[PDB]
Amino acid sequence: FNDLSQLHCSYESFDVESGVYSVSSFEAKPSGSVVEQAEGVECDFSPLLSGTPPQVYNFKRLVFTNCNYNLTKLLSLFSVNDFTCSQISPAAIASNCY
Amino acid sequence: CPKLEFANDTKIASQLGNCVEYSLYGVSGRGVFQNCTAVGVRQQRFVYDAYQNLVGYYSDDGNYYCLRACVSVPVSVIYDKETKTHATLFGSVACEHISSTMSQYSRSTRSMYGPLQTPVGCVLGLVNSSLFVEDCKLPLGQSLCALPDTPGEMRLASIAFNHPIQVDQLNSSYFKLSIPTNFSFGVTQEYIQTTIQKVTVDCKQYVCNGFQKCEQLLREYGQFCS
Amino acid sequence: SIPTNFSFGVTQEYIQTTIQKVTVDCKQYVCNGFQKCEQLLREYGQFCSKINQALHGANLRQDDSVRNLFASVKSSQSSPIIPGFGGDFNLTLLEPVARSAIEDLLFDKVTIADPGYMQGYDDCMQQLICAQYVAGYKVLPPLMDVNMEAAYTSSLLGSIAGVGWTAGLSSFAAIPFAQSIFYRLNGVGITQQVLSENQKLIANKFNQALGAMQTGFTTTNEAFQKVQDAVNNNAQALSKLASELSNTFGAISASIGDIIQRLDPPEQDAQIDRLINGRLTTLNAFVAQQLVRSESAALSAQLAKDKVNECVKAQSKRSGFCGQGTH
Amino acid sequence: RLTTLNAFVAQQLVRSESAALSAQLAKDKVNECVKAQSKRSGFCGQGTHIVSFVVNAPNGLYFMHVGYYPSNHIEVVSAYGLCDAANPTNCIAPVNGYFIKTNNEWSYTGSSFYAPEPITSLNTKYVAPQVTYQNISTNLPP
Amino acid sequence: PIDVSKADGIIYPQGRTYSNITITYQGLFPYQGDHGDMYVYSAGHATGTTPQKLFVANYSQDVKQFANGFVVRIGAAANSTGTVIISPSTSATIRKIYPAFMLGSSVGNFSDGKMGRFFNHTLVLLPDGCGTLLRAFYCILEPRSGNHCPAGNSYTSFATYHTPATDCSDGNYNRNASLNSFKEYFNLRNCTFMYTYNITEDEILEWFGITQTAQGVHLFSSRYVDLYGGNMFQFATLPVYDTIKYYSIIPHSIRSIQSDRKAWAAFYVYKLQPLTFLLDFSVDGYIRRAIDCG
Ligand SMILES: *[C@@H]1O[C@H](CO)[C@@H](O[C@@H]2O[C@H](CO)[C@@H](O[C@@H]3O[C@H](CO[C@H]4O[C@H](CO)[C@@H](O)[C@H](O)[C@@H]4O)[C@@H](O)[C@H](O[C@H]4O[C@H](CO)[C@@H](O)[C@H](O)[C@@H]4O)[C@@H]3O)[C@H](O)[C@H]2NC(C)=O)[C@H](O)[C@H]1NC(C)=O
């Protein structure tokens, strides 16, 4: 609740000793946030939906760099029967920059 | 990166020289802008320290800017037992921040006590007093201390210097001397720890604490406790 | 066997008295301002609390040792410091201007990175010293001020002239320093004759003897070597804070926000568990090494106070204990 | 639990060597300034040590040291050597004492207290002539 | 040899630049003071003004494993005068030349049984127009079956000619005719994509690096930024589908006349192996001094 709360919990008693203690300091509120770097063309997932879908040993490859992606235009129209995510949160795959 | 309604009020120049949560399209964190001279390869755009943290940055338009860290105020506390008296200290900082924007849990203040410039920084909860205490029991660092009233108030004091008795010298055959004229028999009192309480332990009354199964399991460990 | 010539050779040494008296916050260091981190902190936390008053107790023990040793070395009455004291001897280098010129130039050659005890945080907004708060720690201020050890150096400087006459410290006898040297040389076994007509040559060669150590201040001085190795000891001690958060400790990453907003809640709780475990063991290693440094500082402080009370203010009869040759 | 006991063994051997260190410092205290008077400045007792007393404690050992504690220091004059003008080689020096220009000439005083008393042969001894010493002619000391 | 304290052609960190500190890094590096994979180009037979039959070595049939790519020095013999390779009694000023590479993963015997056939989709890169164009293409090669042809009879090896009196004079650049000389020996099929670069010409030496990783084939050079300096900056990233384990150098011919036979560059190739080196990042950031570990 206060400085005395974290004080007395650290000593686990209602009676403590006098003393200079490095109490847990604060962090100032940042003035804001900056989101800037170059963006050009958006990410183009057309060859994923173009052509014959290849085989499990013919797994066709797509590299995406320097583009802008949106899963709300991609996964929303995907009739996803099953979704799994190995060592990653499924929600943040459409949130962070890589 | 994902799509966004690109906010105009998010540029680097908007809060230059100010602490912001930096997010350089994957380079995430929170730090303080500054303007520097260009160092390193401008095509790399990202300059890092010896500990894998960003120090500089080549802007898109071409104005090199450093970001070191968004350093915050270190905070310490004083409290005295048997006199319900307590105050806060802030290290190596001008009295610059007021109660608006902290972090962590709810800070507690009392009646206004206010922000005072000390050589160690800024202090809240102290009243100025040019006092001198040679034998301060709970000092405030550097050469500072506070002493509580016998609703009391701790009051400021510098750690006083014990002035020796100043005696001069004569450059002649006559010499200047100083001499005790009274005395006492002071007792220098101290203590040492010679032999602690020595203790032994069982393997199976500390570890099996009587467990049959435990027994058969510890036989692979065997001679460790031995 | 008997020698027919002589000189005055200086032996240089140093003692690491008071180690860096520091502190580290629990939450800003281990947890670094992250929400799910403090709720998981709640899971543990027993370690953090305890080791904080453990380091507080070690620091106050060191402070008590420091105040005890400056109480011991405080001469109850001393001599004033003026320029030109000490006769023909060029002891202006040890004479304070307070700032003694000898320790001024030692502070010049010793790479001193003062941890911003007056600018600090403000020194970081205007521009390694700022790196004392990246994850977060604080090397506490001294409990002393410069001018305060300037006063102690003045006190011991007076005690040099005042003590080395006769055992029994109740009387203060700060002789004119040339005659103090005369009495000290008579005491340590030099005849009054050559001390009566040959003061000039011995004074001059003592002068260039004390001058040679001024220009000798380089790597060849072993006391410089142990001072700078102590500086490196402080540097590696603070690197034990500064360098370990870069380690993942077996996690998939070492950044907390990375974990909390790019992992699922169960797996991110597991990764925070791993990170806090590794970090608390690094804290235990820190506690062990500062305990070692604290006891070493205590014994070194005992050695330093014994050296300064026996063979500095007076002439100890122990053969070569603190100075090689007939000190 | 085995890791906790390895930590226990480590800290116990640390306390063991610390107790060993305390043992040689213990014998140093009890054999230097307790059963004698230490010639070291504030070795166990602050100031001029007189006596010391030692008593056991269930884990340790307890030390008082009764010592001379000066107070009320005043300002006086002292000399360097009482030597005859006619016989400069005839000099005297105090046996751990001081010369004081008393009322009622330089006389002997102990080196720890305002204790002036007339100069005798039992507290001084003959020394060499020096240019920094002093002459007396109106009353030569015995 | 190759000095590491002088930093002769060593990979730069891809996105982690430092300043004025020494830093350790685990990557792909060669050893210190090595020999190389020494080859050299030369000019063909000529008499008067007409250039006669070619002049190439057995370097087309010498195949090495790709391992982890390789680094090429270019024009270390430039600015100087060396003996003409075809005529040892004749000497001329050494001019810088650039090599043409092919990459794949299969080895087979030729129409005459000489080993070196590559199957399926393979990469060929070629400098043309006095080194102005650096065109690369990952296609299907088809050997011809006529006289002196790779699938034909009376065949020994393969080479690419170049007629500098008409090929790469001021302007013109002969519609990349050395690619047609490659087409005079091979044919293109079933190709997916194709890359081309513009590189200017100078007189200072050149350092080039090639490697591959699952995301792509990475090509590094100095010229692009450090024209006066030297470093590995990734000027190309081929979007490759499969890794590469075999490579070869295509021999190249120059249709120069006999009286004006000019000495060409003597290039070195050093292989890249997984090592850990320490780097001296200076204040400006130019890496100039490095040191090995093993
Ligand atoms: C064949 O012979 C030619 C001679 O014509 C050589 O070319 C010279 O190469 C040297 C070595 O790099 C060059 O020396 C460098 O000069 C720089 C200044 O150049 C200025 O002038 C040129 C020409 O006008 C401009 O294009 C340029 O932008 C500059 O304005 C210096 O700054 C260099 O020092 C810096 O770089 C080195 C290397 O990184 C660092 O070690 C230094 O500390 C410093 O940071 C350097 O001294 C010279 O300029 C070239 N001359 C010409 C006319 O180009 C060829 O190298 C040579 N080839 C072979 C294979 O031998």
Ligand SMILES: *[C@@H]1O[C@H](CO)[C@@H](O[C@@H]2O[C@H](CO)[C@@H](O)[C@H](O)[C@H]2NC(C)=O)[C@H](O)[C@H]1NC(C)=O
């Ligand atoms: C005592 O030593 C100091 C230290 O060298 C002398 O100071 C030097 O004085 C000269 C001129 O007299 C200057 O050129 C030097 O720069 C001084 N040195 C330093 C380090 O400041 C001083 O002169 C000496 N005094 C005597 C009486 O010998």
Ligand SMILES: *[C@@H]1O[C@H](CO)[C@@H](O[C@@H]2O[C@H](CO)[C@@H](O)[C@H](O)[C@H]2NC(C)=O)[C@H](O)[C@H]1NC(C)=O
């Ligand atoms: C006693 O008086 C004699 C007088 O000769 C002193 O001897 C000389 O004193 C002068 C000045 O005081 C010095 O410059 C000389 O060097 C002295 N002579 C010698 C041989 O030392 C003497 O100092 C006086 N004091 C004593 C003997 O204690």
Ligand SMILES: *[C@@H]1O[C@H](CO)[C@@H](O[C@@H]2O[C@H](CO)[C@@H](O)[C@H](O)[C@H]2NC(C)=O)[C@H](O)[C@H]1NC(C)=O
């Ligand atoms: C780059 O590193 C060099 C090497 O340490 C720095 O040069 C040192 O600068 C300090 C400060 O004046 C001197 O005390 C040292 O003697 C110098 N050492 C050497 C070897 O020159 C240089 O200051 C650094 N520059 C920058 C911009 O960081």
Ligand SMILES: *[C@@H]1O[C@H](CO[C@@H]2O[C@@H](C)[C@@H](O)[C@@H](O)[C@@H]2O)[C@@H](O)[C@H](O)[C@H]1NC(C)=O
């Ligand atoms: C940022 O700074 C640019 C030049 O840098 C100048 O020198 C360095 C060493 C710093 O001290 C910096 O503050 C100096 O200004 C300017 O060309 C540029 O205009 C500056 N940016 C803005 C927004 O003014």
Ligand SMILES: *[C@@H]1O[C@H](CO)[C@@H](O)[C@H](O)[C@H]1NC(C)=O
């Ligand atoms: C506090 O008072 C002293 C004298 O009483 C004065 O020197 C000092 O400047 C005061 N402090 C401030 C912050 O004004």
Ligand SMILES: *[C@@H]1O[C@H](CO)[C@@H](O)[C@H](O)[C@H]1NC(C)=O
């Ligand atoms: C010393 O002080 C004590 C107590 O103050 C007093 O009884 C005694 O008479 C004093 N002695 C002298 C010599 O002043």
Ligand SMILES: *[C@@H]1O[C@H](CO)[C@@H](O)[C@H](O)[C@H]1NC(C)=O
């Ligand atoms: C001692 O040696 C030094 C240098 O060798 C010389 O200057 C001095 O005169 C010598 N002194 C004696 C007494 O021999």
Ligand SMILES: *[C@@H]1O[C@H](CO)[C@@H](O)[C@H](O)[C@H]1NC(C)=O
């Ligand atoms: C090279 O430059 C020429 C002229 O500027 C241009 O026509 C050509 O398309 C360029 N080629 C490449 C690959 O950039």
